[PDB]
Amino acid sequence: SDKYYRSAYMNVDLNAVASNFKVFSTLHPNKTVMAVVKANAYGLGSVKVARHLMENGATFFAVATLDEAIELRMHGITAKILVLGVLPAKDIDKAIQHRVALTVPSKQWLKEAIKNISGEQEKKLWLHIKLDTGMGRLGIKDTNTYQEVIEIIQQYEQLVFEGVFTHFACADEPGDMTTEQYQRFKDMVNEAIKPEYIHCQNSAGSLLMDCQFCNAIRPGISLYGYYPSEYVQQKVKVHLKPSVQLIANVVQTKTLQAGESVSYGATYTATDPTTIALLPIGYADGYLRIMQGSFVNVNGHQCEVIGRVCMDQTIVKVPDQVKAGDSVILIDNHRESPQSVEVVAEKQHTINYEVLCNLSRRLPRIYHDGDQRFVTNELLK
């Protein structure tokens, strides 16, 4: 457990994460739950989340990049891992060496990948073909190309057609786009041999749909306790446990008399005699400038963020009784909270996903697992 030397941090509740994972296993008992731990597990810390999820039955992870997969492998993760992004073809041997499954986005990529296999790694290359069913991002859109790519893969004993998958553009909102995409996915997959893993559902799809034709799901944000939209939250009857709190303690208070100001990026002048509190957190921590004017919870009291948020500091208008040492909840681990991740996303003019991703390496993650507490502080690694 690392030390840390500033009173700002994230509480990461690993018991909540395990409980949320259990929700997906329970909803889909016959599917492999491919736990999405990309982008450092949406800010929570991919190594600690993956380790904890393996102790709770997880056997397959998905990440965005090979670096993310190697990071898991370096820290004892023995489960299957799929890279969802496109690997630079020159790095093919490293994927093979570390038994990491790769996404095939195109016939062109596959041909470049094969040319870079040196023969010095003879282990299998496991491949999941990505189909573009209307998202318009990565993948093969044409059935003929899909078949040609399967055939190329079957010509090489080293290359294994392990899976096939697609991504839904609008699964978190009502409309027929998702039904249409799903039908297109089944139509394409039924035109060739079926691989071992067939998957299309992220959090929203995993919560709203059965998808009997598929045998794996890819829950991401919902593993960490958040719904992908309010529509999905309202439409489903499971309970998700938010896993993150963002906390900082007041390091200094001052009382501004009438007509007195302080400048933290812009002038705030006290009209009445008001007390302010200085928090040791700022926009370099991911608590962005736009959080100006939002409210934080200081010892039970809703308190406005005043002046501009600075790189390393934030000022808050507080009651007189507030003092140095008092704990402040900037992001709370409850859905129905003025400091919920969704309310913070509204203030940020964005979505919950990004609120979480913004939280920088400077914040220690304090992991909770029952009574057990351990700290990761990236700066001292």
Next chain:
Amino acid sequence: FSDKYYRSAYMNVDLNAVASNFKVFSTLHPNKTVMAVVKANAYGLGSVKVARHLMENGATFFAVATLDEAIELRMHGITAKILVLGVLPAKDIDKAIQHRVALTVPSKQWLKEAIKNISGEQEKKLWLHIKLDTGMGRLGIKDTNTYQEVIEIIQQYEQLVFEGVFTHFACADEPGDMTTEQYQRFKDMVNEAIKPEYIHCQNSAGSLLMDCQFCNAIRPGISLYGYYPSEYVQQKVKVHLKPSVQLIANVVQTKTLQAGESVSYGATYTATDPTTIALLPIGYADGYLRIMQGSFVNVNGHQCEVIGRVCMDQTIVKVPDQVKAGDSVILIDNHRESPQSVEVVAEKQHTINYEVLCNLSRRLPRIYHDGDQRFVTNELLK
């Protein structure tokens, strides 16, 4: 050593530019200590590599925001003086002492709490820089009597050394008399007690716009990395700063949308004509935020719109037909007068250059350039 990296998205960090920008401040203030501000991981560039490179270019004193930042420097061989600008939790006082890290005194109360936590097990000198609140600016000691009492407390203990005194000016990057009135208040306060070794009030804007003979040290920050703290400062001073950052990603896939076909979440871009799109392996988890939708990036010389929603790991760009997988894209360019300048990216983000830089996440490898030499830091593979 140089880390490997396994996705074609990265930052180019030009260490020669950083050294050149540092040299600007040394040259403008040849008799002052240039206290190089490398807080927040050197505004995203990487504090360890910037500090090492700046030490090789004559830097002898760094400022950081937190003790963790200072210890990080110490663990990677940085032997220069270091000042922590933030308020240290009083229980951590022995760790500051152990690692010869100077601390900011913000209040008499803090100093009294700090002294109570000195165990006697770390006997090195504790260097202290007193922060003054000169009216308008940041919090600190506001009253001269309290300033004197704090000096007196420090002089009671041989272990505690009154090493410096400082303030931070409100609005030094904008036109007005606020800076002048504040500077005068700073001098008035400092002249009421013995002068410590370091006297400092100037950040980037103050270091560029003012001499300040009364001071013997400056604290340049964002300008070390090649950016002006405001357009006013850029226009007012006729010195040249070299932007140090490029953000780059290569096209991984190109596809052609037909009339009626959509792209990304919510299907917010629909093709009307047949148009070519390119997929970049970078997104908002890298700090290229959702709001960048509708901005332009430079693909092989061509200005190209970011279309559909920016994803966590992916960004889609409308491109000419000749664009293909492998082509390099400049998302943030190392020139001030560029549609991909950090300032234009800040405008699109409804923020300031500082935050654009700070947003860039640990997932991005930093590729350091120093002449012909290239070395990579990839945080994921530590």
